[PDB]
Amino acid sequence: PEGPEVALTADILEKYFKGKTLEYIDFISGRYSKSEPEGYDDFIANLPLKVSNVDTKGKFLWFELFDPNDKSNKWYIWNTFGLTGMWSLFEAKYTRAVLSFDNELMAYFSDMRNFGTFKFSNSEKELKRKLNELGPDFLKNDDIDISKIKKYKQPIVALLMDQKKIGSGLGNYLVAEILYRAKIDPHKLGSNLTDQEIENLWYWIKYETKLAYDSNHIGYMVNLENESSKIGRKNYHPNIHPTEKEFDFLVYRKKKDPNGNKVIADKIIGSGKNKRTTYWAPAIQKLE
């Protein structure tokens, strides 16, 4: 899941749990099964608490809770999905966390690979500190200045994959689809892009994120597909109007692009577990 999936999941989470009373959380399997997340014990001891919001910034999601009997007791649930992390209203296969609310309400987080993370904290300061680690939300921020791209002599694919330098929310498929639409070669250094290309790139980031966010079944949040179509969408990037009804991969994991050009499954950024495969068609994307 990338920026859009996280945001749409938060939206759904708020629809069902905002204002509800959380009573407990169980980590029944996975990485937290035996060793609970940081702050878990203190958090459990302070439950029940009501949920006031479920917000996101890029790929980062969090629950904000408060204590109905102590205005000063505020708590937060930090969450990152990882490659296989999914939220749902039913106990799906590979459920790792089970959130029990009052009045029959239940939420679940599934994660076959166990890359998602959890953390509980009662500090707004730490939350603000954490949010400073992320750049503007490429999907939610409609007035982002990406001219900072010029100050970097690094492949543009690395700059867009990074969550701090220019903005947050872009993943391996969004960056590939966006660089294809902007006809820019992944290896092109930021400092070598023209002001025009910058403008053009900005346009397509808004375009793709919005298309992704408005979709109902891209595939990375299948446990919420039924609910995805039973809820609306916020109006991010208002002045951009994608023509397609659903997000479709033009090069991401494709052997050829729409026209017929070949797509290179190029491994440009990352090391070890962080290495990712960038898909691009040399026919369309040039270093110019």
270 torsion bin: left (phi>0), alpha (psi -120 to 50), beta (else): left
Task: Give least dist CB 73 to K ion, A.
Answer: 7
CB of 111 to K ion, least distance (A): 36
The rounded distance, in Å, linking the Cα atoms of 43 and 48 is 9
Q: Which residues is 137 bridged to in the sheet?
A: 168
- Judged by beta carbon, residue 73 or residue 192, the one nearer K ion is 73
CA distances from 278 to 69, 178, 185, 198, 263 (A): 51, 11, 11, 20, 10
What is the C-alpha separation between 79 and 56, in angstroms, rounded?
9
Residue 158 phi/psi, 5-degree rounding, is -70, -40
Q: Judged by CB, which is closer to K ion: 73, or 226?
A: 73
C-beta closer to K ion: residue 72 or 274: 72
Q: How many CA atoms lie within 13 A of 32 on its CB side?
A: 27
Q: State the minimum distance, in angstroms, from the CB of residue 69 to K ion.
A: 9
In whole angstroms, the minimum distance from the beta carbon of 78 to K ion comes to: 23
From the CB of 102, what's the least distance to K ion, in Å? 23
Nearest to 148 by CA among 132, 137, 135: 135
Contact 107, 13 (CB under 8 A): yes
- Residue in the shown chain whose Cβ atom is closest to K ion: 72
- Looking at this protein, which amino acid is placed at residue 89? L
Q: Which of residues 63-82 bind K ion (CB under 5 A)?
A: 72
Window 22-61: contact mask with K ion (x via CB under 5 A): ----------------------------------------
Query: Which of helix, strand or coil describes residue 215?
Result: coil
Q: Closest CB to K ion among 72 and 271?
A: 72
For K ion, the closer of residues 47 and 98 by Cβ is 47
When the beta carbons of 71 and 151 are compared against K ion, the nearer one is: 71
Q: What is the CA radius of gyration of the chain?
A: 20
Active site members: 1-2, 57, 276
The total number of residues written for the chain in this structure: 288
Measure CA 172 to chain center.
Answer: 11
Angle 239-146-253 from CA coordinates, rounded to 5°: 80
- Which parts of this chain interact with K ion (CB under 5 A)? 72
